[PDB]
Request: fold
Amino acid sequence: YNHYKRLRNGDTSNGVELGKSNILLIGPTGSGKTLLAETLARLLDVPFTMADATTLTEAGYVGEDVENIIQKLLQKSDYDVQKAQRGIVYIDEIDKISRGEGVQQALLKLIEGTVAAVPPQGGRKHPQQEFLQVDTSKILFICGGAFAGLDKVISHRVETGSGIGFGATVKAKSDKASEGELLAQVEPEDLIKFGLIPEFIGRLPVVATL
Amino acid sequence: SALPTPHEIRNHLDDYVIGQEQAKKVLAVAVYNHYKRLRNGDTSNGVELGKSNILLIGPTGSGKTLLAETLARLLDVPFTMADATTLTEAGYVGEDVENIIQKLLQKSDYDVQKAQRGIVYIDEIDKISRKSDNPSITRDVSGEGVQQALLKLIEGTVAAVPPQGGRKHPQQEFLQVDTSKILFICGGAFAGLDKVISHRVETGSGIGFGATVKSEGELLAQVEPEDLIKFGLIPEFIGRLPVVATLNELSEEALIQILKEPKNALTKQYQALFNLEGVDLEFRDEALDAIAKKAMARKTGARGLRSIVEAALLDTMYDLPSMEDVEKVVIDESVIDGQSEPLLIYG
Amino acid sequence: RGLRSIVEAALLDTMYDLPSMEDVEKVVIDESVIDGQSEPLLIYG
Amino acid sequence: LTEAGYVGEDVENIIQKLLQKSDYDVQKAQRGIVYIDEIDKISRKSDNPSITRDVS
Amino acid sequence: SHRVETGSGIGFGATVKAKSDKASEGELLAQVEPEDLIKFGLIPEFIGRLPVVATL
Amino acid sequence: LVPMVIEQTSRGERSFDIYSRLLKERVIFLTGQVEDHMANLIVAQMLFLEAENPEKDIYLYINSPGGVITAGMSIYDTMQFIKPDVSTICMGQAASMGAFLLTAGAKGKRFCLPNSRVMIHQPLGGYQGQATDIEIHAREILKVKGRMNELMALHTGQSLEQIERDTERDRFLSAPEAVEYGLVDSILTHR
Amino acid sequence: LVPMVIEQTSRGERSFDIYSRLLKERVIFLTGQVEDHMANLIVAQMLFLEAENPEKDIYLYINSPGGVITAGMSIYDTMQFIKPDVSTICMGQAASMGAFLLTAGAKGKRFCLPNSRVMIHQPLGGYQGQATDIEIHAREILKVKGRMNELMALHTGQSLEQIERDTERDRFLSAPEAVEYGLVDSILTHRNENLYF
Ligand SMILES: Nc1ncnc2c1ncn2[C@@H]1O[C@H](COP(=O)(O)OP(=O)(O)OP(O)(O)=S)[C@@H](O)[C@H]1O
Ligand SMILES: Nc1ncnc2c1ncn2[C@@H]1O[C@H](COP(=O)(O)OP(=O)(O)O)[C@@H](O)[C@H]1O
Ligand SMILES: [Mg+2]
Reply:
C-alpha cells in the first residue's frame, strides 16, 4: 500500500523524496512466498515476474542477467514503461547466493534503483538510442528464500550459547513451532552471520517471516 | 553564466549529507575546478589543465555513495555510478572496464562530446586491492588485473565502447570516447587500513630491553600512499588518484541529526506519507535518541534506521487508512521499545 | 604525479574559499604552507 | 588485447586506429609509428611451463 | 541422485550400498522436482507452465 | 586420541577437536585429579568464555577423585568472581574437592546424574621437621578445614556443626542423598 | 591437551590456543614451580606485551608453591623495568617467590582472591664441599636474604625488622591478612561490584 501510495503521488510537492522500501520474505519451502506476491499482482493490475538468484550465482555478465529480469517484466507489461515501473518483482533463493558477494552487489544496485536499457519489441538489429529506458527505483522488489541455518543462529544469540551439553535444550521433534517464533525475532545481525551483505540488508528494511 | 562556487555546492550537499566536512570540501573544489577546466575548452595559452582524481575512504554507512548521488542532483555534466567488483581483466567473461563509459553515455543520451566532460564514481575499489594476494602465478583477474586496465582510463585514452549492452568482439561498431577530461571518484571502504597506518606510526624498533617502545577518522586522516601500497594498490593506481578524502564514522548524535536535519530525512518521509493521508505525524526527541541507540546496538549504522521506523509504525500504518477522525499521531520512546503503542489524537 | 597531490592539499582550503572572497588579486605560497604551520598570504587590491 | 578468439580484443585493432589518423590511407599508415603502453602487463608470471594459456 | 541420496554408513548396522544399487535413471526420474530441472538449465517459470510430467 | 569434529558454519566448514567444540558451547570438563596445571587450564577457559559473552551460563562437568586444595579454591574463587553462572554437573563421581566445586555452582544450576556418587571428607596433609613449623602448618590446615566447612554449609544451607560432624571421616552420598543434603539442586534422570 | 579457540578477525576466522588467546588480552599465567625456562617464557611474554601496547596494564595470575630465586629475580626485574603496570593476582596460593612477585606488582594493582593463601619464608639452600666454599655460598644466600627482605619491605611498606622476624619461619597469610600486611592492596570478590579494572 505504501509503495503504490508513493507512485500515486509521484510529485509530492514538498522538499521530500519518498524512498522505496523493499521486502524480505523468510520462510520454509512451500509456505506461500511466491503465492503472496502473485496474489498481490492479481489484486493490483500490475506486471509480476519471478527470478531465481541461484541461476544468477554464475557471476558472469551479471548486468545482462539482472537486466533480463526487467526485460521479462516488459513482455508481461506489454512494453509499457509506466505499467512496468509499477510491477512487482519476486526473487527466490536469495539465501543460496550468500556465503557470491559480486552477485549481491549487482542486485542491490538494481534494488536501490537504476536505469536499464531493454531492446524494444525484439528485432533483428536496433540502434542504442532506441532501447527503452526503464527505472527500477519505482519497481517493488520482493526477495524470498528459506534460511535453515538462521534458526540456530538466533538461538545461539537470543538463548543460551549452548546446544551440546546436558542442560542444552535439544528436545527437537521437528515441531517447528519453536522455529517460527525464533525467526520472528530475526534481526540484521543474524542475517550477517548467515552470509548476507549489510548493504543488501539495508535495502530490505521490511522483513516478513512465514 | 557564472559557475556555482564551492560554498554553494557544499550547502547543497549539506542538505542531504551530515558530518563529512573534508570530503565535502574536496568534492566541491573538484567539481568547481572541473567546470572551470571545461569552460576553457579552447584554452588559448601555453597550458593544458590536467585533472586531479579523487579517492574516497570511509567506513560503511559513512556517506560515500550518498555523496555521489547528491552531486548527480546538482551536476550539469553526466554523472554515473559504477561498481568495481564486477569488472574483470580483458579476455575473461566476468565484465570489462569499458562498460563504465557505456553507462555514462546512457546518461548523456549517447552524446560523446557530452560524456567526455562527465564524472564517474567507482565504488568498492578496495575489493580490487590484493588483500590476501597469495601470488597469482596462475592469474589475478578480480584484483590487480582490473587496476592495470583502469590506469589508462583514468589517465586518459580513447576507449572503444560498444553501442549498447554488448561485449567487445571483432565487430567494428565501436565509437571512440576520450577520458582525458573525465573525472573519476574512486570510493572504497578500506577495511584494515587503520591497522596498517598504526603499524607505520607505531612501528617502534624491537621487543626487548634495548628496544624503544612507542580515533578511526583521525587515524585515517594520516593516510599516505605507502599505506595503500601495503593494502594491495599498485603505486601507479594511487598516482592516478592524487586527492584523498577521509570520512569519519557516524556517532550517535549524527544519527539523530540524520533523522530530521536532512532534506529527505526518514522522519520527513513518513510525515509526508501520513500528511497525504490526512494525518499528522510527530516524532518526539526521545524517540529519535532511542532509534539511534537501537541502530548503534545492532551495528547497522544509518541504514538500520529505516527498519526501526518501519517496524514501530507497522501496526499504526495498517489501521490508519481505515481509521477516521484521526488528526495526529505521537510517537514516544516506549513505542520504539515496543512496550506501548503510539498515541493518537481524535478530532 | 605526487606533486599534484601536494599542491592540491596545500591549496585545497584556499580554492574552496577563494571565489567567495572578493577584492583578492594575489595569492602567495610560502614554504611554511606546505608544512602546514602557516596559511597562504593573500593580497587585497 | 587478447589471444585471437577471446572476448577482449584483437591485436589488429591497433592498425585500425592508425588508419583513422591517416584517413584510411593505407600507404600513409604502413610508414607510421605505434606506441604500445603498459607492455609489462602482458607477461608470463615467471612461469616457463605455462600450465594454462594466458589469453591476456 | 545428489538431492535424494545421503550416501551409506560404515558400521555393522549401517546399510552398505553397492554399484548394483546405484538407482540409475530407471526409477530415478519419477522423484524429479522443479529444482532439479532448474539446475539442468531450464527456467523456473517454464516448468510451472508444464505441470504434467510423463516419465518413461 | 582426541577425535576431530566438523562444525558447519555459514560458509567455512571448520574442524574442531571434541573438547574445543564443546568449549565453543560453554562446556568445561574437570577430569582426573585436581592439580595446578589442569586448574589453570579450567580458569583460562572460564575467563575466555566470560570475555566472549558474560551473560551466558557456563557448564562444568566433574568426574574426579579430588586432589590439592589450593587448586580447587582457585577454581572456586574464579567461579564466584565471574558474572556467568557456573552450572556444575557430576558425572561418575565427585570427591572432596570435586564436591566442594559441585556444591559451589550457581543456586538452582547444580545437577548430578542418578548413578553418580559424591564423597566428602576432611582435608589431608602432613609435615616433617621441627615442632615450630609443625605447629604452624597444623593451624593452617585447621583454618582451611574450618573455612571449607563454612563454604560447604553456605552453599548447602546446613548447619556448620552438622557439616563438621559429617566431615570427620569419609562420607559417601548417592544422587538422591545429595539432593536432600543441599549439595545438588536436581537430578537429570532422562531428557 | 590445551583447547583451541576461534577468534573472528576482520580478515576471517583464526585459530588460537587458550593460553595464547588470553595473552592477546594482556594476561599471563605463572603456574607451577618457578624455574628458568618458565621464567624465560614469562619474560618473553612481558616484553612482547610491552612492545604491543606499553600503556595498558598487564595482568599476571600467580598459583605456585615457589621455586628457584634467580628465575624469580629475572621476572621481578622485568616487571620493574617495563612501563606497563603489572597487575598481579593470587590464585590458590603464593609461596616465597610467588609472594615476592605478588607484592612486586604495581602499587594499587595487586589483588588476591577471597580464599587465597600467601606464604612467606626465608630462602632455602645448601652446599657440600670444603669449608671455604661453604662460607662463600653461605654469605651469598645471606646477601640474597637481605636483598629479598629489603624489597619486600619496600613494596609492603613495613619495617625491615618486622619482615626479618616474620621470615625466620614459615608464615601463612589469608587474603585479609595480606591486605593489612601490605602484600596486597585489595581483594577481588566479584567483577561487577568493584570494577577496579
Ligand atoms: N552522512 C550521512 N548523512 C545522511 N545520511 C547518511 C549519512 N551516512 C549514511 N547515511 C545514510 O545511510 C545510507 C547508506 O549510506 P551510504 O553512503 O550509501 O553507504 P556507503 O557510504 O556507500 O558505504 P558502502 O557503499 O556500503 S561501502 C544512506 O542512504 C543514508 O540514508
Ligand atoms: N498458504 C498457502 N495457501 C495456498 N497455497 C499455498 C500456500 N502455501 C503454499 N501454497 C502452494 O505452494 C505453491 C507455492 O509454494 P512457494 O511458497 O512458492 O514455495 P517456495 O516458497 O519454496 O518458492 C503454490 O502452488 C501454492 O498452491
Ligand atoms: Mg560504496
Observations:
- Chains E and F do not touch (no CB pair under 8 Å).
- The pocket of AGS (ligand 1) is lined by residues A 199; B 17-20, 60-66, 123, 189, 250, 258, 262, 302-303 (CB under 6 Å).
- The helical segments of chain E are 34-40, 44-49.
